[PDB]
Amino acid sequence: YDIQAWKKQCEELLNLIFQCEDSEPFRQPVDLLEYPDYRDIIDTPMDFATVRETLEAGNYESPMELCKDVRLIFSNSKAYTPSKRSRIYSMSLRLSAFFEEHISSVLSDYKSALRFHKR
């Protein structure tokens, strides 16, 4: 029932993601010189360095907010891919599967802890 435990659990999960080769295209903002029309397609760019910085700045109140930003990395990849067989999109699908598998217990534990706090 530790209401704060999600933060370190999210830092460790972000460390795992950074070690994964599939995270390479998503570790820093999409390069607008490389993809000049990116902002015509994507309204809200997001990447794992921005997620890690928001977390370290104390600017996420819950793991749900972190999860919404991480999911935005994956939905941006899906929206910008010209094909469902592209390299970067294929990497995003595996990384999303890994992320969802690991974040489930973090979300569950946090929601359980908050319900106990207000019991």
Ligand SMILES: COCCn1cc(Br)cn1
């Ligand atoms: C890392 O992303 C670079 C921009 N982009 C390429 C595809 Br495919 C999807 N998004």
